[PDB]
Amino acid sequence: SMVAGSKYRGEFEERLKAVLDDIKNSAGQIITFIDELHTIVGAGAAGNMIKPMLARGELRLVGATTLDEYRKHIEKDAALERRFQQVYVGEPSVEDTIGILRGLKDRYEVHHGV
Amino acid sequence: QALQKYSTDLTARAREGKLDPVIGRDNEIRRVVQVLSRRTKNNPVLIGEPGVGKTAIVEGLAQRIVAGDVPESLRDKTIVALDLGSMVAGSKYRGEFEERLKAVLDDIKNSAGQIITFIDELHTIVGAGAAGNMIKPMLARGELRLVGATTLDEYRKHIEKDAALERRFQQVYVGEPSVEDTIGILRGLKDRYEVHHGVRITDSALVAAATLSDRYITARFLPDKAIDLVDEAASRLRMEIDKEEVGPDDIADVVSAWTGIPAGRLLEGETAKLLRMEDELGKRVIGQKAAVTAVSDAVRRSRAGVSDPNRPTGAFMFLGPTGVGKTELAKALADFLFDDERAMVRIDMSEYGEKHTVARLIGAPPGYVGYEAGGQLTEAVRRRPYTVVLFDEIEKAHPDVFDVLLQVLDEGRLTDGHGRTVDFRNTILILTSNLGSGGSAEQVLAAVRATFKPEFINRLDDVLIFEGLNPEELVRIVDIQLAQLGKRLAQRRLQLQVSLPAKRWLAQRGFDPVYGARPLRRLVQQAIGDQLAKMLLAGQVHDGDTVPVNVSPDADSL
Amino acid sequence: QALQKYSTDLTARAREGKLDPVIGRDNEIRRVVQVLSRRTKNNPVLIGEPGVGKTAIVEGLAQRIVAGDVPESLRDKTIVALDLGSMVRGEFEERLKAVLDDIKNSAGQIITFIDELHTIVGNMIKPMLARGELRLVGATTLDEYRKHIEKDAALERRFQQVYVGEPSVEDTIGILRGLKDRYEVHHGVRITDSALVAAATLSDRYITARFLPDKAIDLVDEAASRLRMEIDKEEVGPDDIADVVSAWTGIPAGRLLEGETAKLLRMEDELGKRVIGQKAAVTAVSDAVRRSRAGVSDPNRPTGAFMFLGPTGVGKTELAKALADFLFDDERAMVRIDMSEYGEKHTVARLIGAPPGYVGYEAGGQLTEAVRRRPYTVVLFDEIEKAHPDVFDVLLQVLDEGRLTDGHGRTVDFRNTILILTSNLGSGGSAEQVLAAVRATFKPEFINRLDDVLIFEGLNPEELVRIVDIQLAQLGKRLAQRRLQLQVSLPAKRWLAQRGFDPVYGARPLRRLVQQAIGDQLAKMLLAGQVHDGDTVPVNVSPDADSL
Amino acid sequence: AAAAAAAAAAAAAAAAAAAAAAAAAA
């Protein structure tokens, strides 16, 4: 949504600066969730004015990618990679799948009357 | 007033008791001053590898200027960093950014020496104009100072495309510190993290963190990789009060949740697991005493922290005749180290029969067809550095695979065409083989020595030789196969009642002593599963009602 | 005139005085000027090792021009140094076209200089280069000259290959004392006279990746670099050379000089630090290997052809590793081949190679392709007595000439190796019937060409303790992670001697035996409990085993 | 007043090939 009609010399960066201002003037509250953050690499033609906001502990930024899309973009960008953690989520078992499937049953009985 | 808005002040922020204590690393502040206190080509740049500290040099320069402990032509100067992300923002009427940055440079011309420009990440001035050639004559007039800080490779990938820029530059290398300097930096930082998180830190837990995090993860450098364990331990101890201080237990428990190496402490549930392990491993591999004991001891040594951390934990090979359990045993140790039969890397080198197949386990050279993809053996261990790795039929691999497999051993790390190194410091390399099958131990080891490289055996652990099989051993294998065939029939709730003369009749038949245990598996389903499978789809074997087996001269009726 | 802000110039700078001393090398200049004045081919390339001073050759040519010694048909040329970093697509050829157009806008003496042009050579230059309005002086490297210029060529028939070579020691001394009056400026000391030749002589031996003209610049300029600390003694010295070269290669400063008597008289009891036992054998080897270093025999024979046989499990190959790491300074420089398969006619050809077209060719010879690289190796020959009598003709000219032919056709030189021919027969006869069996097994002519047939023996029951002491020394170094110590007890240390001999193998169970009982029992201890850091770990004997 | 007008590009990446070098088996 940020890149939509921003076809002038400085419109994307001032939109991003307005967003970062409305994050910064709050105290410690807003937790940004950016899904598929391999998109944050390019998007300029800019897109580099996030490093001082990240490397002060001011932005909170929970975000999830896949496995290979990480090393195709972010491992290519070894300066950005330091200001992150890695929480490796692995596959569950078959018994834990059975334990999950007893929880999602009510929604599928609501949507289809079976 | 041309820069009052587009660049906030930096020294006044340090004057208001804010930035980090910077005790340590005194030398290159004096070296950057010695570069800076010249008449022309002052203009330095701080260049190293990412993470070894280049914020701390400028922060320490600010602290020494605020403290007034500087030489003569450095007193009461104001360093100012300009942001190229708010200056470019509102500029669309065909000329605005040009004359805007021109007026900023004109206001930089006003003060002499007192203004010092520190442009963070100075490869934004090469581009991001529509730039560069408007500040370029202004650099070599002694007006602006232009201190900066870049990555090592980004300076020679983007910045050094024009030679006429390096006349206005001078490189300053910054190296990674030591372990003792890391101890000093951690004692210097040991006041900011106890006020922010109101808990106290034992000096034992301060000294254990940087000591213990050096065998483990090597992709981040060490002014700060020891800070992260301590801060996460403080956060976890704050969580646990929602034992009131941190300890060396907590560093080991956090780093064994991190990158996920289960070389943690001695939790008391697995003590009886590791002690009583020969029988727990003997729940699926029955037989082979002296091999199970050796593998069990090689697992047990690395858990106690005795062997040298410059090798894999267990890197060994076992072979012998056919159908003995050499492929069965590797599936059995990962079935309790992981409780997952599929978390191991099982590759088969019976396909690498040419010189150019090495690239499928190391990854392609950069930018040919498949540098997007990456390797197969390399990229699966780098994410989770604990998996056990098989190698099935090491015979038929071309002996150029062994040249790549060599530096895996005896160093720990393996290079690749991506440009990286992956360190196999606590995996388990299990090599299988079927050489010879024609001697007891002389001829088969003679054939092994005639097949490998001469020092490739000494780098290995105990090369094991398997037994044959025995008629006494063969009863419990029939017990295992009957239990498996019973548990396969548990969905449709059938079961069997096997008589002891039939259970030994399965042991009398099928004793060809060259084919191993594999003919008995076929013989059971030639006896039982065919007759039952014919009856089951013909009615009359309705579910729940079990069937017994009875002896009849060469078949067995049901 | 518009490119000089984007390019450089070493003709107007050649009248400043920024140019180096041009001491030595006054024939390659004549070769380059002879190449440069021709009708075709007038674009020389200087081919040689990197880091020698081809740039200094072109600076000396410009320094010869600015005073004038070349003939009048090449009077008052202008030479331009090219910025080879100024383009690294979108710039690798884009600014290059404007540079070549400004060269086209000369019709004159704007003779170029491109350094390391094998990374810049594709065919855009050739119609402009073969038209004749520019002279392309270049400098390359030898190995990439067989890679880049011969497949991507398109004009390789328009170069001359001027070979610049390595300097001698004395020419390096002359250049280095020519470049001695420059370093009163960046550094300030009183330059020691003999330190120049001392630094060059000590840099001659062990530095390999760097080359002799600037290998003596990685010296003294560095020797006064760390002497900046003493003004935070105004003469440099040989120790000022020694603490740089010793603390860079990680080698202790014992053999700072004298590689012909020091560590030739050290061939002594330091063998006993590695080889326990066999006193007279060490004495005989220490005598025999220094007869070759006097230069009395012929120059083309192996340095020592001495061979010995006796029991197994003694030190018979532990002596072999003990002289590779000392005399050749390399831990892994031994070659242990086994002649336990060579009973047939189709087995000898494995140790020399196959012809070009047959089965074992890429692997080469079993012997020769491990001697072609690293020809500073000790070579063993295990179990010679079962070999078919078609090895000894191959093995004979090894110890009769210093040459042998491989599967390819190349030549190997054996004049600086050591042959050792071991066996295991004997060991029950004292001296007489064993040498009789040697004379009966081999030809009598085969023993005249060999050196001493020195004889090993068993081991003393008390001296066998110190081997177990060294094994326990290697034991305790690994468990420094728990920072433990192990107090061994001499009754158990006697007990391991009887159960670690087994007179069919010698003394080889010990690498397994010191692991098994001790390490496994203490591993169960450390993982269970009842032992912590700082523990002395007392060991004793409980009636049959060794309890803790 | 000035617009940016982003542009396209074309990327090349070729492929190696191996020869098999038979052996006369004697």
Ligand SMILES: Nc1ncnc2c1ncn2[C@@H]1O[C@H](COP(=O)(O)OP(=O)(O)OP(O)(O)=S)[C@@H](O)[C@H]1O
């Ligand atoms: N001598 C030191 N004493 C204390 N902290 C230090 C020291 N050196 C570095 N640091 C810390 O290291 C960090 C500064 O390193 P960085 O400048 O971030 O490295 P970097 O490669 O420049 O990454 P960027 O570009 O700044 S995001 C801060 O967290 C400092 O507290």
Ligand SMILES: Nc1ncnc2c1ncn2[C@@H]1O[C@H](COP(=O)(O)OP(=O)(O)OP(O)(O)=S)[C@@H](O)[C@H]1O
């Ligand atoms: N000690 C044993 N306990 C239980 N089952 C065994 C034992 N030994 C062999 N088997 C059975 O025999 C089969 C042998 O499988 P593998 O280990 O793949 O054969 P192998 O011994 O590796 O022979 P090759 O040469 O590698 S195909 C397994 O499927 C087991 O069920």
Ligand SMILES: Nc1ncnc2c1ncn2[C@@H]1O[C@H](COP(=O)(O)OP(=O)(O)O)[C@@H](O)[C@H]1O
């Ligand atoms: N005749 C010489 N006079 C002065 N310096 C020389 C001479 N020959 C070599 N050098 C030294 O070698 C350097 C030049 O070597 P160069 O030709 O650039 O080698 P490369 O091209 O491989 O880098 C100079 O710094 C200089 O000190």
Ligand SMILES: Nc1ncnc2c1ncn2[C@@H]1O[C@H](COP(=O)(O)OP(=O)(O)O)[C@@H](O)[C@H]1O
């Ligand atoms: N003097 C000695 N010094 C060190 N180790 C010795 C000595 N004598 C016997 N050994 C032991 O014997 C082993 C060497 O045996 P080796 O010489 O290889 O036997 P072989 O005669 O079969 O080659 C070593 O592992 C070492 O522990």
